[PDB]
Amino acid sequence: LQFYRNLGKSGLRVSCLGLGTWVTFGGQITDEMAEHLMTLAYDNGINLFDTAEVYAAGKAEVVLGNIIKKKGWRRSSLVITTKIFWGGKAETERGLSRKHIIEGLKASLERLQLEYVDVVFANRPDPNTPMEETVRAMTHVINQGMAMYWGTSRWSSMEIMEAYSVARQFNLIPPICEQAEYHMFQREKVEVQLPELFHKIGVGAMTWSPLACGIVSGKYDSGIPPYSRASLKGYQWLKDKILSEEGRRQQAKLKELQAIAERLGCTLPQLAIAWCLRNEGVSSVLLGASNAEQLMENIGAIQVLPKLSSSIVHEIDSILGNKPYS
Amino acid sequence: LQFYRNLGKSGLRVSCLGLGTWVTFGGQITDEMAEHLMTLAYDNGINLFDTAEVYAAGKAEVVLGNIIKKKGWRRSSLVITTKIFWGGKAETERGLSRKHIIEGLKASLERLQLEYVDVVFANRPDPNTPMEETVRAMTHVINQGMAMYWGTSRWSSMEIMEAYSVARQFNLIPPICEQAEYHMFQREKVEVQLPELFHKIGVGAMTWSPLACGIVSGKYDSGIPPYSRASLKGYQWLKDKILSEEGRRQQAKLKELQAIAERLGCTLPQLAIAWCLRNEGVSSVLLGASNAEQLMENIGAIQVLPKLSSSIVHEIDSILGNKPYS
Amino acid sequence: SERVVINISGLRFETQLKTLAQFPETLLGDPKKRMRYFDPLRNEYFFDRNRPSFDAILYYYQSGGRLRRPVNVPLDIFSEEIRFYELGEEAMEMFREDEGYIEFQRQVWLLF
Amino acid sequence: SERVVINISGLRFETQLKTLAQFPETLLGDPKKRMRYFDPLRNEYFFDRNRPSFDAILYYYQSGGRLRRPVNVPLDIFSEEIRFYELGEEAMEMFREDEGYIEFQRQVWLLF
Numbered sequence: 001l002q003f004y005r006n007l008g009k010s011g012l013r014v015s016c017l018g019l020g021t022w023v024t025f026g027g028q029i030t031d032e033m034a035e036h037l038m039t040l041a042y043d044n045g046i047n048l049f050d051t052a053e054v055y056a057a058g059k060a061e062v063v064l065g066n067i068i069k070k071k072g073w074r075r076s077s078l079v080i081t082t083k084i085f086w087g088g089k090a091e092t093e094r095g096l097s098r099k100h101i102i103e104g105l106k107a108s109l110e111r112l113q114l115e116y117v118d119v120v121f122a123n124r125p126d127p128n129t130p131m132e133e134t135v136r137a138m139t140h141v142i143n144q145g146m147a148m149y150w151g152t153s154r155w156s157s158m159e160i161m162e163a164y165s166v167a168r169q170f171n172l173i174p175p176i177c178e179q180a181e182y183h184m185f186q187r188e189k190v191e192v193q194l195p196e197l198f199h200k201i202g203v204g205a206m207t208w209s210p211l212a213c214g215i216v217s218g219k220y221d222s223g224i225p226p227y228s229r230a231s232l233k234g235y236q237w238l239k240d241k242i243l244s245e246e247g248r249r250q251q252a253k254l255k256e257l258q259a260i261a262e263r264l265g266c267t268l269p270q271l272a273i274a275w276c277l278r279n280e281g282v283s284s285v286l287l288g289a290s291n292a293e294q295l296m297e298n299i300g301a302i303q304v305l306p307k308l309s310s311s312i313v314h315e316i317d318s319i320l321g322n323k324p325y326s
Numbered sequence: 327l328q329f330y331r332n333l334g335k336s337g338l339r340v341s342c343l344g345l346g347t348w349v350t351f352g353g354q355i356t357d358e359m360a361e362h363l364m365t366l367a368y369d370n371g372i373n374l375f376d377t378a379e380v381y382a383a384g385k386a387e388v389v390l391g392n393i394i395k396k397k398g399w400r401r402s403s404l405v406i407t408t409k410i411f412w413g414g415k416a417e418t419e420r421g422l423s424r425k426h427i428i429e430g431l432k433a434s435l436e437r438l439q440l441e442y443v444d445v446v447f448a449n450r451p452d453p454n455t456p457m458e459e460t461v462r463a464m465t466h467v468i469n470q471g472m473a474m475y476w477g478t479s480r481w482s483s484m485e486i487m488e489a490y491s492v493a494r495q496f497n498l499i500p501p502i503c504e505q506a507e508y509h510m511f512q513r514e515k516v517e518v519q520l521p522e523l524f525h526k527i528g529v530g531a532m533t534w535s536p537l538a539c540g541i542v543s544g545k546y547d548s549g550i551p552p553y554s555r556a557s558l559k560g561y562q563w564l565k566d567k568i569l570s571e572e573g574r575r576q577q578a579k580l581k582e583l584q585a586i587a588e589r590l591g592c593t594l595p596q597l598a599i600a601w602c603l604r605n606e607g608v609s610s611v612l613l614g615a616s617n618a619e620q621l622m623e624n625i626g627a628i629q630v631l632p633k634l635s636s637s638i639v640h641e642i643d644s645i646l647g648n649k650p651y652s
Numbered sequence: 653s654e655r656v657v658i659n660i661s662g663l664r665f666e667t668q669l670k671t672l673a674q675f676p677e678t679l680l681g682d683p684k685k686r687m688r689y690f691d692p693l694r695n696e697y698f699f700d701r702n703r704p705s706f707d708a709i710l711y712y713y714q715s716g717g718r719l720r721r722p723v724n725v726p727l728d729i730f731s732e733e734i735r736f737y738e739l740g741e742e743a744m745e746m747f748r749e750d751e752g753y754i755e756f757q758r759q760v761w762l763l764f
Numbered sequence: 765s766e767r768v769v770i771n772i773s774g775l776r777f778e779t780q781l782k783t784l785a786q787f788p789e790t791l792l793g794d795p796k797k798r799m800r801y802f803d804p805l806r807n808e809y810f811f812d813r814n815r816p817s818f819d820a821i822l823y824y825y826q827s828g829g830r831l832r833r834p835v836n837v838p839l840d841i842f843s844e845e846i847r848f849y850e851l852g853e854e855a856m857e858m859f860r861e862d863e864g865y866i867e868f869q870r871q872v873w874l875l876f
């Protein structure tokens with residue numbers, strides 16, 4: 001129903017949808033296309049735009065950083081987020097140590113040509129760095145004016161809760177959000193473990209890959225289309241899981257879900273995106289797009305969210321047959 | 327086995343070996359040689375490079391600061407450490423007071439031409455400054471962006487533990503590491519007192535002088551070679567202990583250890599350096615070198631570390647006859 | 653091993669989550685039950701209740717069954733706290749046993 | 765003189781290290797024994813155990829021998845805590861003494 005919603009308990013207002021810069025920005029699509037996608041997303045009300053220091057070895061933030069500066073948008077109107085972990089080939093340039101968190105975020109801000117990101121993320125848990133060191137560094141870069149908030153990604157509920165209990169121990173800033181994969185074929189984490197944290201400590205969820213990198217869109221039911229996400233260099237891993245025997249049963253269930261999409265007067269991508277927003281813990285969904293048609297189609301999932309009734313939801317949970325045991 | 331290892335519990339990844347700038351940089355050897363040694367050490371994977379504000383009255387950091395800027399190495403790839411204490415001939419320019427810790431580190435960063443060192447050290451315990459004042463200052467220079475971490479040197483376990491218990495008292499940053507002398511003739515501290523701290527509070531050990539300033543190398547078995555560390559000006563104290571009666575029994579035990587070095591297919595310096603790395607508390611060993619041959623030989627101690635079995639270790643502990651009573 | 657802080661009217665109690673999860677039926681053993689008492693600013697569960705009684709309640713989790721009323725806590729007050737923490741009907745009747753507590757003919761059987 | 769903080773299920777106990785080192789045989793007197801219970805984030809030793817019993821245990825170090833069961837702690841519970849803290853067989857038998865506790869012919873000697 002409501003478009004903008006608070007990222008977790010915090011007062012940061014983000015749109016229910018957002019534009020990611022993975023694979024596309026500075027890599028798959030041209031920079032001229034990346035400007036067109038942000039301009040469309042920004043003119044459609046989306047303010048949350050996500051990136052990371054690993055995408056295109058920083059060329060994603062350079063692109064994202066140029067679009068923001070070229071368009072001259074008010075910095076107070078944008079919610080820019082970056083993820084810190086894989087900041088170089090050296091030993092001291094990966095992880096969540098006090099050194100790389102500061103160096104990596106300072107480098108990301110340099111590429112983004114921004115004084116601060118709105119949220120800085122830990123791209124994945126780093127078992128080689130103590131939790132106290134990571135929380136103190138994340139609290140440090142917030143007080144220095146490099147970030148308004150900080151959150152986690154790919155962390156377990158036990159690791160998220162520890163960062164909270166350590167922050168309360170040393171009077172530091174707890175994490176406000178968690179990025180977790182969530183589509184119609186990956187739903188165990190965002191529907192079981194995370195909802196307990198959204199009520200206990202109020203950690204929101206910023207889900208990613210609502211279409212499983214395009215698999216849920218249904219374009220791979222015949223083969224690997226050219227200029228797709230599976231045909232690109234370095235994504236043979238995706239082409240393997242798509243053409244695998246397990247990946248073919250996923251496409252088979254899409255035909256049954258395709259009937260629900262046409263029944264509700266929408267497309268299959270719009271159904272799966274709106275299907276992700278049906279939870280209270282999901283504070284936003286990060287959309288991917290390689291052209292203006294895909295992005296403008298994905299934004300249409302806001303209209304499908306009201307059509308999702310318990311009848312339609314239970315019908316989808318029966319077609320998928322992967323509802324996690326609570 | 328593993329090359330890079332965490333400095334103590336912290337997430338700072340340092341190489342098991344490192345290059346020091348004592349006596350040599352800006353003093354014994356030329357600056358052209360110092361560049362050649364760092365380039366060799368850096369191209370061999372070593373990222374930990376140690377200095378202090380007292381070495382050559384700051385000319386060591388000037389040299390080290392120029393090599394880093396001349397080579398254009400990524401600051402995120404280097405682990406630069408400096409030690410603060412003897413920062414001048416005045417009364418307020420030595421010790422661990424809030425004044426000199428800040429002034430001394432700010433001066434060291436100026437000579438190093440760096441925004442921050444990775445770890446700032448207390449070169450020795452200062453009984454004229456309260457522990458709370460020293461911990462608050464060390465915590466201060468960390469939050470100001472002048473240092474990522476801070477550690478101690480020549481401190482006793484009781485003094486290290488106090489800095490931890492004071493940091494926990496005032497919600498400050500405890501020390502992460504301790505520099506202590508450790509060679510085949512100095513082993514009481516790193517093998518008895520420090521290991522308890524590495525498990526209790528997780529303070530790592532960055533040992534220094536693995537060859538006792540070259541004594542364990544076995545070059546002083548005949549006399550004082552020219553262009554040696556004992557022949558240099560201001561190091562008559564070393565020539566005294568080498569030519570002393572006690573220092574001659576040390577050279578006598580080296581002949582028995584020389585047999586083990588040739589038996590294991592290595593040199594005597596490589597044995598003693600690898601012998602230092604055989605502990606879990608030893609997070610890194612700071613190597614000295616006055617030429618490219620010595621440095622490239624010392625790096626070969628990584629291969630001797632697997633050859634060090636309990637048979638070889640107990641054989642060395644029998645030749646030395648100084649295993650500390652636990 | 654996750655630590656749990658329980659605030660009883662100002663009296664601080666700490667334990668491991670596995671100790672409370674040992675009895676998943678009670679209040680503090682059920683995460684959904686104790687959710688309504690959590691303080692996200694202090695990371696603790698606050699209860700505005702009797703203080704001397706909770707020594708034996710938290711020990712009922714540590715000992716894993718033993719429920720001994722404290723010598724200074726009244727019998728009625730301690731017994732009403734067991735109902736709130738929901739230790740179970742089995743442990744409640746064991747507490748009483750440990751304390752010392754064991755038509756045509758229906759109307760004629762009343763006046764006799 | 766080094767201070768030692770002992771956390772007993774939320775109850776805070778502080779003492780000097782020399783007081784616990786007075787008895788190097790017990791748990792808290794042996795640094796290697798108490799190592800497994802240290803909390804490097806709070807600088808304290810945490811124990812998820814009974815709370816009213818530890819008043820007398822820590823006083824056994826301060827008094828240097830006296831081991832008097834508290835009047836509100838049961839006899840079995842306090843005695844099982846002495847085993848955990850490992851106060852020693854000499855102090856254990858003194859506690860019982862203070863509380864009040866002192867073939868051809870082998871088969872024929874059984875039925876008689």
Ligand SMILES: NC(=O)c1ccc[n+]([C@@H]2O[C@H](COP(=O)([O-])OP(=O)(O)OC[C@H]3O[C@@H](n4cnc5c(N)ncnc54)[C@H](OP(=O)(O)O)[C@@H]3O)[C@@H](O)[C@H]2O)c1
Binds near residue numbers: 154
């Ligand atoms: N936590 C993390 O580390 C993490 C991990 C992954 C993603 N993320 C975030 O999630 C964002 C995007 O994730 P995602 O790429 O997985 O999104 P997705 O929705 O799962 O997949 C997007 C892909 O689907 C295809 N597609 C795009 N628009 C379409 C449309 N309208 N119809 C049909 N197909 C369409 C595109 O591939 P083609 O090029 O084949 O058209 C696009 O790359 C990233 O920018 C990143 O911010 C975060």
Ligand SMILES: NC(=O)c1ccc[n+]([C@@H]2O[C@H](COP(=O)([O-])OP(=O)(O)OC[C@H]3O[C@@H](n4cnc5c(N)ncnc54)[C@H](OP(=O)(O)O)[C@@H]3O)[C@@H](O)[C@H]2O)c1
Binds near residue numbers: 506538540553
């Ligand atoms: N905590 C502290 O305050 C403290 C104290 C001392 C040292 N340190 C650290 O330790 C580092 C070095 O200590 P150190 O000089 O005592 O190291 P060391 O290994 O004990 O002695 C190094 C000396 O041995 C000789 N040598 C070097 N390479 C050799 C080789 N391959 N074969 C034979 N001999 C060789 C050189 O002297 P010649 O010039 O005679 O060749 C060199 O100066 C310093 O840079 C400093 O960072 C710290």
